[PDB]
């Protein structure tokens, strides 16, 4: 499965007729779901897959990155700020930004120098991803190869065509979960692990319906 | 360590008066630079030798 006609589907068994023609099953994650008809063009359907995969890979680093400064707070490690969305303003703090509870680490003080180094470093590695760089030029734009896969996992292409499906399915989970973290911090105002503990405290009373009357127009 | 410094500093002026006079004579002679190439390097380095030697014992004076 996961390729060809007989594969997993977005409606499961009730899905043999909603699948369009152009979503055949040569690509990873091809569950045949284009209900709003966005990728009816072969060039454009090629183009969204770079957008989906890169969003998938940034979200997998966004999911774990928003979690580990709060799980380590549950191990009693002092941070100055452990909540993921309040974490950015700790360079305005008096001690500044230390990488853990260690003022002998990075000890960042100036926000504008931290941003300006980013726009040079991230400014060039995103350019290497497009055209080419020190780690190779004429490669696959999404699965480039050897310097980013040192461990040789991209061999035996039946495994390699299967590890791709592992990649986006973890990834599509992560993009869905990072859309979680935004909303559950806009509406509640607390962290994800903290509001996980709020639901595991009393699940019947601690749901989104406890905040359902929040955004009403009070005029 | 005063008199150690003064003999070393009278030695500097004698070497500098050689290098002020002899070094343009070395250049402006025909093939004088290909001949006395290692000769000038002795006189230049001994100038660089003494200037730190005079320079170090000023802490001792």
């Amino acid at each position: 499965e996961f390729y060809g006609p007989n594969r997993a589907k977005w409606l499961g068994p009730y899905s043999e007729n909603a699948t369009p023609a152009y979503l055949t099953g040569e690509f990873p994650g091809d569950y045949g779901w284009d209900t709003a008809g966005l990728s009816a063009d072969p060039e454009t359907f090629k183009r969204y897959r770079e957008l989906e995969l890169i969003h998938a890979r940034w979200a997998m680093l966004g999911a774990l990155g928003c979690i580990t400064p709060e799980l380590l707070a549950k191990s009693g490690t002092q941070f100055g700020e452990a909540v993921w969305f309040k974490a950015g303003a700790q360079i305005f703090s008096e001690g500044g930004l230390d990488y853990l509870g260690n003022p002998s680490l990075v000890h960042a003080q100036n926000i504008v120098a931290t941003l300006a180094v980013q726009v040079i470093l991230m400014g060039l590695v995103e350019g290497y991803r497009v055209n080419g760089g020190p780690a190779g030029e004429g490669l696959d734009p999404l699965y480039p190869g050897e310097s980013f896969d040192p461990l040789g996992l991209a061999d035996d292409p039946d495994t390699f065509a299967e590890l791709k499906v592992k990649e986006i399915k973890n990834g599509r989970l992560a993009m869905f979960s990072m859309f979680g973290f935004f909303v559950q911090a806009i509406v509640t105002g607390k962290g994800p692990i903290q509001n996980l503990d709020d639901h595991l405290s009393n699940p019947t009373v601690n749901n989104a319906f406890a905040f359902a009357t929040k955004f009403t127009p009070s005029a | 360590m005063t008199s150690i410094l003064q003999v070393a500093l009278l030695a500097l002026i004698f070497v500098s008066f050689a290098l002020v006079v002899g070094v343009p004579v070395v250049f402006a002679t025909p093939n004088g630079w290909t001949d006395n190439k290692g000769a000038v390097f002795s006189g230049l380095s001994l100038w660089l030798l003494l200037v730190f030697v005079v320079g170090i014992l000023n802490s001792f004076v």
Binding site: - | Q6, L9, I13, N58, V61
Partner: protein, 37 residues
């Protein structure tokens, strides 16, 4: 004044400012040596 390990060299240092005036006078000496070719 000069430091005391340097004070026997005050008569030499009172000549040193006049030296760059003698470089422009040297350039007329050298042009007389080539006889103004």
């Amino acid at each position: 004044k000069l430091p005391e390990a340097y004070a026997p060299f005050a008569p030499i240092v009172d000549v040193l400012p006049v030296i760059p005036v003698f470089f422009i006078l040297l350039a007329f000496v050298w042009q007389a040596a080539v006889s103004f070719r």
